[PDB]
Amino acid sequence: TKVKYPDGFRSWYHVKSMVIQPGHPLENPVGGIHHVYANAEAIQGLRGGNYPDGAVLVFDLFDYQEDNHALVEGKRKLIGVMERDAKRFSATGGWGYEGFGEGKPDKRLVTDGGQGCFGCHAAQKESQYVFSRLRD
Amino acid sequence: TKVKYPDGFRSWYHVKSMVIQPGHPLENPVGGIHHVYANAEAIQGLRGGNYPDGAVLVFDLFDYQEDNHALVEGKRKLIGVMERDAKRFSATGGWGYEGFGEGKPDKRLVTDGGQGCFGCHAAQKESQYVFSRLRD
Ligand code: HEC
Ligand code: HEC
Ligand SMILES: [Zn+2]
């Protein structure tokens, strides 16, 4: 029913990163430096296996500061969380979608059962609703 | 007295990231998006302990493409590597300094036994020659 807060996600595998800057269509609300993390189960899916129930992907979003031709990580703005449960999250393609303001377990953001999240991630049906690609 | 190639570093703990853009005093050679990784042993030092022998820090440098106000990871340019051995690397303050072109074990970049690396990292003697700070 609810997505679990992914405790210890900072110790997980770093999948990839990207920076979204002002002018980007998604500056509101995912402007900043983001890092994608995967637990062991999510790595199975990312490698081209299937995602086991209990796979978790985290979108970790930082604000950044301009420091002399460097973008420096500032405060955490939020995390997004995808948790795999084929049965419990069947209404949103087997992934539960949640946001935590500032990465705080007490600041749950999603109000529509993740239908908005799923609406965009649906475009990625062929890669099991995951945008991020495992890179070397 | 050569630094070992840190095989499996991509599975290690992600410490932090930073973007170095053109015009930065160090754009040559570390312009791009970099990610710092730490093995279990390096984490002990980042948390406020003594860096044990066998601690490894990796500076993982990607080129990026600026595309519609996103900075998107491209190809790996290089890795930098600090390997802790108080005895073997005593001439450079107990860290061995190496680079690998494109992160490939056969493309060693350091030609002065790491004296140039050490010359800058010496400013951080008080944090055992490490710039990166562990963040949550
Ligand atoms: C399109 C308009 C999107 C909406 C709405 C949401 N997400 Fe999404 N998400 C999107 C992109 C383009 C990416 C890839 C970023 C990259 O660096 O390549 C993501 C990624 C995630 C991830 C990581 C897993 C993955 O699919 O790559 C998570 C955990 C995630 N997003 C969660 C999430 C939630 C909880 C949303 C609703 C609150 C949500 N997303 C909206 C595109 C879009
Ligand atoms: C100053 C003029 C530097 C020189 C020359 C070298 N490095 Fe360094 N390095 C520098 C900074 C400011 C940072 C921090 C980056 C950040 O995101 O905060 C780094 C970092 C590293 C790391 C990561 C560990 C750390 O100390 O934070 C490694 C593994 C590293 N550098 C290796 C390295 C090597 C191999 C060098 C000579 C080839 C070298 N660096 C030189 C500053 C400077
Ligand atoms: Zn300038």
Author numbering:
A (entry chain A), B (entry chain B): 3 to 138
Please give the exact wording used by the authors of the publication that reports this structure.
Of these, cytochrome P460 (cytP460) is a heme enzyme that oxidizes hydroxylamine to N2O as part of nitrification (1), whereas the evolutionarily related cytochrome c′-β (cyt c′-β) binds the diatomic gases, NO and CO (2). By contrast, our recent crystal structure of cyt c′-β from Methylococcus capsulatus (Bath) (McCP-β) reveals a hydrophobic distal pocket dominated by two Phe residues (F32 and F61), a structural feature we have named the “Phe cap. Proposed roles for cyt c′-β proteins include protection against NO stress generated during nitrification.
We further probed the roles of the distal Phe cap residues (Phe 61 and Phe 32) by comparing the properties of wt McCP-β with those of the F32V and F61V variants, focusing on NO and CO complexes. We assessed the impact of the Phe 32 aromatic quadrupole on McCP-β heme–gas affinity by comparing the structural, spectroscopic, and kinetic properties of wt McCP-β with those of the F61V and F32V variants.
